[PDB]
Symmetry: D2
Subunit: 329 residues, 4 copies
């Protein structure tokens, strides 16, 4: 019908059946919904699958997303599962998890979320063998290492959100202090995501210049107070979001979207994602956040940072405690 | 400090103190938070104020937004009020309201939300005299007319979200049926936002061609079933979101953002926003959704649609019932 | 080397060997260089081949383009030929041609450019069988029909620049007169590209409203003068560019780029490109500009415009004269 | 008229009379036309004035630009002069100049172009007192210093294109060698624009890591050959464009546009533009290219690079020869 409006051309060939850039978000709580809303507005995928337990809410959220799509670039948003709608997805973003019950042990919450991952990752290994797994569930360093051991995927394709969020705020706050384009600053926050993450002051760089030209002790007193207050501001912000709101959703959603951009657009961009440590600083068999080149096939290269003696000791201490916690599980 | 990194140029003049494009969202529930997240990602404002009752949540949401800003274009996001941080805002977006209590009358819920608006709009009139007020609270046609009567603003600057959302879905679904760019379709949903909104089939247009070249009765039977099913699909989607999720947030957030774009960028774009009826079709003293040219100063022009006899009767019936409901308040 | 800066990840898989969106411009005079500069800045292709006779200029232009690429999105720009670098290109844009010698017949210039096309299109048929051919050489309607007969390609993939440029100016000037978004106006210039192109006033539409609600004779006198002056302004601009500059390059370059966008991004967008007439208005065996839906596989659909009696007679007269000119070749 | 299509709203206020971002290009040869085409496509200005001697070509170029505008964002492009259409422009881009006659001295060509600048800059000082002057005419370091002495403007607002083009190619080629995002590389080409420009290998940085961790002599032999070949590739490209084409237009046009972006969008971005040397490395009373933070008011800050002994000697030698050449004028 409608041939009186638009007359079809008989010589026109059928459109190509191109493979869509395809993602799936597992766990559609506040974090997963924030990721979905951002990735839809920023047009990350051609097809986006949302997987959670069958409820009217999940379907209502999907229909809410679908009804607003005309205002943004198109995306085939839908509810589904890995084994069905989500087969051969390019990126699998896992935000699924459960909240710590009243009086529950930290090891008990880990074993509960790890059990949740084992059921999830079994479908990912079977139906998304070539996919990159982006882990967001906390603690992200433990869950990223568990995902690596459960899946058996190449370590390059098991990626955790890590300290990407705090590093970006660290970079932006430092550039704001100096009235300069934030893309001119290379300052990394590495290690275990949380209160023990390490700012790499020794290699912090602004447009080629070292923020610490010699050693930290040689810096003027006012610069040491200003630089230390900037990193403290980053840690205060992450803590206060959990204290005032209970959790982060919008910030981690934007950081997760940014990681997806580097992967899908093959940007070869430096990101402090969480990933397997393989020999650097004598650290093995654990996941930490280190600046890495991220592209279509995941973690392609690692920035071979030379840490100061104090910075490296903090990193190896975090690696020791993370290996101990995982051995207890 | 940091003059060993960046040497300030003595001849450099101070930067200009330009006036920021400034908005304020009142009511930071699910609708207001969705609006804020979208307007931040899409970089609508230079400064965005979020006003709601003083809570740790609102401040936690603001800090969540602020912590994720490095990943998107900058916006000075903050919590505040109209009388303080929000003075002389360009756009005031009102999503504030209360939920219908168990057994509460529809007239009782209106009088409660109208009382909420009277306290809000008193500050808007005093401190944002030149601002455009974008009304989103339901029922949007009643609340838009109440805002016009309370503020005394020019009717061009009192704008309700109206049927912009359903019209965009209507336009996109029709273009998808015909395998054509949605920007080639001009098909409007007008009237009262809800189950009684009117699709203007008589003037529905695709790239210059009328979807209904003569009258609706002259259309082939299969085209009448297909066209009627498309509008029914639009109304089913809006109802099912409320049924499954309880409310819309992401869809209305994107539609509200789209209205803001037309205003702040002076796009002179046709939008079926809700606004004061002033003589067209003999309708007066009420707010309905009609295609209007929207730009920097609000509703600039109105598309002078010629409705069919059946379409106009439905519109005048909705105007009659809306005037009766408001007289009872 | 450089492993002390970036440490390669052994588990990282090799990047995918995706097929690049590939175009080739034949004829790098002022028109072809303008097309290339625009298509590079607007990031149309992943790989762009420039074919002209072997000279230091062509290679100098390519090296000039290559040296400035860091400031725009990447494109593998290079000099080459259809049979080598340009094999299996997605779009073949032909601007090649020769200037009319002093005292040369219009039929002699056609037979010279047609001979140029026969040598070019032989390589296109052999090495770019699935490509879309975008014809820009003047007269575009004759050269588009010659390309169709020489190649034997499906008529959907033989596209001429046609009246796309003048239609866009026509649309923009009309919207400027009415203080409205130009995307709300559907006003087409059809027929033979030149002084005899036909403005379709009978179906000219603004946001659903007909500019001519009844007949042109029924319009008020001042509206008839204003509307006629707008189309006259379009024809004066195209003539004055040739009179003052000698040719158009920047305008036709932007119009050609816009056609490429609709093809490569599968936009299904209405364009008055030149193409084969197949029965509409009783016109056959000739190329004219008619509003058509353009997408990945070329001319997919045709807007089935109902012309007025005067508009259709002008169109059939242009078809008669174009068929006579081609028969003489 | 047209009130039967669009009904004007009586309560609608008049649009604001905002000040347009305004630029003017002086000299519309191949360089100026390339700048104009790029700045129009990339939507740099709200109003762009093109100044050259009164000819049918200039007006034909302007009309060619104007006729293609519907395909890109709007810009009020026009022909005019500084004293009339170009009053109070934000940026004045000067590409004007004359070609070296057969057997003309290098000092004679300078005195001819300097005389051209004196007539131009007299109008700029009178009618564009707060404007930033972007100098592109060769030799850019001499012409930038002449512009500073003729105008008497603050040295922060006299900017030459300098080595911005070669630095961007240098940065991109180095990042391509390492399979990394080019924004992670800070490698500068400084000094006199030409064959004697200096690559700052001592501070070349990739994501925080120094390309030369100790001294250049300590680098492995293969890395020294690869790094030296990359800079040689940059100098070969700039020379071959002049050898094969006679001049650069597209590359310098994109580089000039990039400088305009940093100014108009207040990006505070590091650019190796040419500017007045004021004490650094003991260099005074001359213009050289040094990494500088560029924003709305011009050169705001200077990256305080610590050069190696060999790098600094080459820079001071170029400063000595540039001061000698200018003293002879
Ligand atoms: Tb595969
Ligand atoms: Tb400051
Ligand atoms: Tb060590
Ligand atoms: Tb004002
Ligand atoms: Tb279809
Ligand atoms: Tb009536
Ligand atoms: Tb094929
Ligand atoms: Tb006007
Ligand atoms: Tb007929
Ligand atoms: Tb001023
Ligand atoms: Tb490689
Ligand atoms: Tb020194």
């Amino acid at each position: 019908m409608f041939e009186k409006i638009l007359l079809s051309n008989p010589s026109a060939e059928n459109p190509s059946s191109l493979r869509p850039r395809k993602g799936i978000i597992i766990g559609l709580g506040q974090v997963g919904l924030a990721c979905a809303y951002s990735m839809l507005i920023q047009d990350c995928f051609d097809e986006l699958v949302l997987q959670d337990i069958a409820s009217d809410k999940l379907e209502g959220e999907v229909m809410d997303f679908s009804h607003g799509m005309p205002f943004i670039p198109p995306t085939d948003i839908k509810a589904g599962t890995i084994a069905n709608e989500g087969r051969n997805a390019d990126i699998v973003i896992i935000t699924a998890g459960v909240a710590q019950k009243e009086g529950e042990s930290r090891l008990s919450l880990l074993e509960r979320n790890i059990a949740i991952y084992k059921k999830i990752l079994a479908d990912v290994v079977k139906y998304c063998p070539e996919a990159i797994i982006l882990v967001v569930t906390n603690p992200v360093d433990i869950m990223t290492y568990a995902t690596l051991k459960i899946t058996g995927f190449p370590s390059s394709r098991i990626i955790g959100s890590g300290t990407v969020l705090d590093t970006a705020r660290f970079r932006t706050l430092l550039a704001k202090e100096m009235d300069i384009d934030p893309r001119s600053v290379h300052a990394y926050i590495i290690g275990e995501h949380g209160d023990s993450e390490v700012p790499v002051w020794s290699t912090a760089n602004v447009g080629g210049m070292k923020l610490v030209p010699n050693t930290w002790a040689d810096l003027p007193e006012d610069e040491k107070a200003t630089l230390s207050g900037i990193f403290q501001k980053v840690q205060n912000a992450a803590y206060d979001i959990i204290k005032l709101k209970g959790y982060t959703s919008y910030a981690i959603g934007l950081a997760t979207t940014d990681i997806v951009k580097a992967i899908l657009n093959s940007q070869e961009r430096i990101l402090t994602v969480s990933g397997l440590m393989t020999g650097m600083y004598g650290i093995e068999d654990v996941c930490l956040s280190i600046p890495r080149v991220v592209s279509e096939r995941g973690i392609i290269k690692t920035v071979n940072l030379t840490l100061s003696e104090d910075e490296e000791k903090l990193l190896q201490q975090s690696a020791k405690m993370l290996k101990e916690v995982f051995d207890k599980i």
